[PDB]
RNA sequence: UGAAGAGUUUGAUCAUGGCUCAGAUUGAACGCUGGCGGCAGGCCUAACACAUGCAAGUCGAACGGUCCGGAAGAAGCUUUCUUUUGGACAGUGGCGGACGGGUGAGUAAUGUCUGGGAAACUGCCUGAUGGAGGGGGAUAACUACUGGAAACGGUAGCUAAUACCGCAUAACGUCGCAAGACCAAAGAGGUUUUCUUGCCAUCGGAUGUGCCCAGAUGGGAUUAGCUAGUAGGUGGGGUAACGGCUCACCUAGGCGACGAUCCCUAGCUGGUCUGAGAGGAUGACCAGCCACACUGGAACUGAGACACGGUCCAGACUCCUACGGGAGGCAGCAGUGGGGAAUAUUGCACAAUGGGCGCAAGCCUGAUGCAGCCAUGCCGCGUGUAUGAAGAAGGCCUUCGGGUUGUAAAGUACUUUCGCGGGGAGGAAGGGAGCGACGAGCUCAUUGACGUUACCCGCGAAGUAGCACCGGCUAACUCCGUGCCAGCAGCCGCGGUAAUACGGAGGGUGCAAGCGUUAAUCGGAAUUACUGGGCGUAAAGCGCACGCAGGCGGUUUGUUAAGUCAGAUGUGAAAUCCC
């Protein structure tokens, strides 16, 4: 799965942590809530840094917290 | 053990059993794998008193599936 | 059913409705004309609703039905195109017990409610016991070939004979059986209701 | 009725007269009861006479007495100690009397 | 094709507002009233305590004895005794008990519901490939002796297997480097040179599962900051497997108003009922899943139970006892007692269907199939049905004229109950035997209800009946008695000499054992209103300014397109809702 995030944490070596947001409608409501989440997506290159969009696919586990991995980057910067 | 035997439909006064496919484990009026046929002990529903539509259970016999002995005598008959 | 002294009802009701003898002077009503009870003959102040209330009274007394399904037929006549009040009548006379009345095989909707159920009537063929059945146009509605000897329906039958049949039906006493022909409008019943004031007390 | 049962025994404490209120005068049976429930309130007495003394034990119905403010509850006579009421020859189906032969 | 509420706050009116009434359902009942028949159904209160019986065995084509039965011998007869053989009990050996059945306490959690993913496993069964050479060892039964009241136990001696172990062949598989070395396996039975049953190793199929993930899953913040393995990294340990799951070291984070943590409650779901829909309530029967069997905890053996009739430890109870010491626990079936308003035969039986084991024969199976008790409910008949005199009696009502109940209120017949006699169903045929290789298939016979109900046929007597209510809502009237007197009442009220609401009587309505009554669940309420609402005076705008997050936001173009929308496909748990 292709996820598209943020990239507000890069103190972690080697591992960093995309913020992706979404957008789904209310199961009573109907009107559309903002939802985050945090994904700790596995970075080897240590190539992307804080303030970078990037996209995020489903790769093997690297650790517990880890189960996803680097694929590229969207944009350069926006913090 | 997938087996095919008679799924009673059994009701007062109503004797129809449904030659089916299903696992041995699965209750003898649980849920089935697939029907193959019907049969009718007294055939006074219909004139039709069986329907094992060989081609069906040709498919099952050598995929693993065993006939009980009941049933054998109804598939048997063809 | 009510089940129980019809020859009372009549009287209630003001009109001679037919349960039984109505056609020998024994009927009560031709002997004393007044409701039942003591307050018979003190004179009755009737309402807007109180017309009405026994309006229907009569009319479902006559078929002899519970109040439930009378009901529940007015609902669906009332439902589908047409006068309602003409389909009224329609339905109710299209009752299996009701036509069997009419071909003469019984006395009354009582006894032939009790054929029905005791299965001595057939309808096209197959045999049906149910008084509320719906008999649609064209269906043969004959004597049961075994009930075909029963004393009770042998005397019916013989009564039968030079007694003519409605316009909408047509019997046969030969060969003890019956057609329904079609569905018989308010020109051809010649019953003592108001249809007009029987839709008015639903309507409330 | 807690549990929201239709009948609850009781063991009663007291069998005293009540006075009805304005509209009203008369001496009223009544009695408290201390159902399994754990809660004593006072249940009206039916019937032009009844049998109960300290020890009496009878099933709790439920109903209001418009006349005694606070009587909430009716008595079943016909069951446990509480002996149905003596030559009723109206309301037996309440009370509790046998049809006489 | 889908939507009509009413009563009560005023002297009167409108508005607001709460309560209340008839509806459907519930593994019930009490009060008083009873005939029958089909179908269905039964401790919803103490997981309170339990007498008694039952709830798993089956194999001699595994092996020695005893018990039961048959046949053939040594004998003139008897005693005694020998051989062969059938079944099975005791023992030894094999398989099974974690399936089924019961209950819902506990449980808010991927426990469950819905869709995916993979770091996996799967006895028996099915398809495919290959193989089964030689050898060695052990413990019971049995025999002898001793201890104990018993349970039961100690010692000595003999002995076999599809019981255990060592070596080869390698179809293969495993491990390092990279593209090398190592490691398997028991027969038996026969129509015995031909098959049958079974085994060893590998791959796959079938089926059943372990684990992980997105979303969804009650009430309260008068429950808010909480957390130390607590969050992450490296290495190691551990498991079938991922994971701080566990350990050492290092880093120091992680989570929270999209409300963690804590507390309360409840098996969950599919569904059930209700409603126009939305939604609400519920989830009892049946089906799936989860959890629990004296209370609590834990582990082993195994494909699978951390396992009711398995084991170990702690605690209480009951029973047995020469008190030394043992035997159990029905929230399994029936049943007892207690409790309670209250819910049943400690009955009959296996042929059918289905299930376990066996090649088969066959055995086991209160799973189940039926009957009994109780109208608790529903369907064709509670107090009757149909017939019947211009109607002389009795009960009922009455303006006292009359009217009503009209088998007569008598009888008679009945739908035709009940009861008696006969026949006797499956809405299912085999087991066995004959033909065939006791295989397939074909043929035939026995056994009927469940160790006799239903239904059919015949005979046949009419063969009980009561309660609630009658002012209004509630459908159904006056006289008499009493007299704010006694009493009635859900609300509005009624009764001080004409009271239809008090007690009685005549009459009438309802029920037609139901109807009333009591209790419980849903909506009406557009009174939280998303669809359906309000805030000057009726309940209701913050005293003001400003400002964070958030919400909303002018115009033009391009890329992405995550949201959104569309086609196809997979799943759509099953069941149901809807038709």
Redesign the pocket.
């Known amino acids: 799965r ?3 995030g943020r990239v507000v ?1 890069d ?5 960093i ?1 995309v913020a992706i ?5 209310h ?12 994904l ?1 997506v596995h970075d080897e290159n240590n190539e992307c840094g804080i303030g970078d969009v990037v996209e995020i696919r ?1 790769c ?8 996803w991995t680097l694929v590229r980057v ?1 944009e350069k910067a926006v913090l | ?3 095919i ?2 799924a ?1 439909h ?6 129809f ?1 449904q030659v089916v496919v299903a ?9 089935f ?1 697939e029907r193959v046929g019907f049969f009718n ?2 055939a ?1 529903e219909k004139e039709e008193g069986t329907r094992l539509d060989l081609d069906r259970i040709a498919h099952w016999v ?5 006939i ?6 109804l ?3 063809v | ?8 009802l009549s ?2 009701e003001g009109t001679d409705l037919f ?3 109505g056609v ?3 009927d ?1 009503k ?14 009755p102040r009737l309402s807007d609703y109180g017309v009405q209330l026994r309006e229907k009274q009569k009319v479902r007394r006559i078929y002899g039905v519970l109040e439930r399904q009378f009901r529940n037929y007015y609902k669906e006549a009332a ?1 589908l195109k047409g006068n309602t009040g003409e389909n009224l009548l329609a339905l109710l006379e299209g009752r299996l017990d009701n036509v069997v009345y009419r071909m003469g095989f019984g ?2 909707r ?2 032939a ?2 054929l029905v ?2 299965k001595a009537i057939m309808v096209n063929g197959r045999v049906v016991n149910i008084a509320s059945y719906q008999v649609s146009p064209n269906d043969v509605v004959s004597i049961r070939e075994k009930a075909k000897k029963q004393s ?1 329906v042998k005397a019916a039958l013989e009564l039968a004979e030079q007694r003519e049949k409605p316009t909408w039906l047509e019997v046969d006493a030969g060969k003890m059986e019956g057609t329904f022909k079609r569905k018989p409008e308010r020109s051809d019943l010649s019953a003592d209701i108001n249809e007009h004031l029987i839709v008015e007390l ?3 | ?1 807690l ?8 063991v009663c404490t007291r069998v005293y007269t009540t006075t ?2 304005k ?6 049976k009544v009695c408290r009861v201390r159902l ?1 429930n754990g809660f004593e309130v006072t249940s009206y007495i ?1 019937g ?1 006479g009844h049998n109960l003394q300290e020890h009496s ?1 009878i ?9 005694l403010p606070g009587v909430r509850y ?1 008595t ?5 100690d509480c002996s ?1 009421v003596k030559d ?13 032969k």
């Open positions: 292709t996820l598209q944490s103190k972690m070596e080697k591992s942590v947001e979404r957008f789904v409608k199961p009573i409501y109907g009107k559309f809530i903002k939802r985050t989440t945090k700790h489903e093997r586990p690297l650790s517990k917290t880890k189960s969207v | 053990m997938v087996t035997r008679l009673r059994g009701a007062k006064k109503r004797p059993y696992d041995s484990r699965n209750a003898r009026n649980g849920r794998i002990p007294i006074s050598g995929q693993g599936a065993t009980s002995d009941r049933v054998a005598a598939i048997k008959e | 059913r009510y089940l129980g002294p019809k020859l009372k009287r209630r349960l039984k003898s020998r002077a024994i009560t031709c002997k004393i004309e007044q409701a039942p009870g003591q307050h018979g003959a003190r004179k439902r006395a009354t009582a006894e409610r009790q159920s005791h009770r639903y309507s409330k | 009725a549990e929201a049962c239709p009948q609850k025994r009781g009805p209120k509209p009203n005068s008369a001496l009223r399994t039916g032009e034990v099933l709790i119905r439920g109903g209001r007495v418009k006349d009716h079943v006579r016909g069951a446990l149905g009723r020859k109206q309301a037996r189906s309440k009370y509790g009397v046998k049809r006489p």
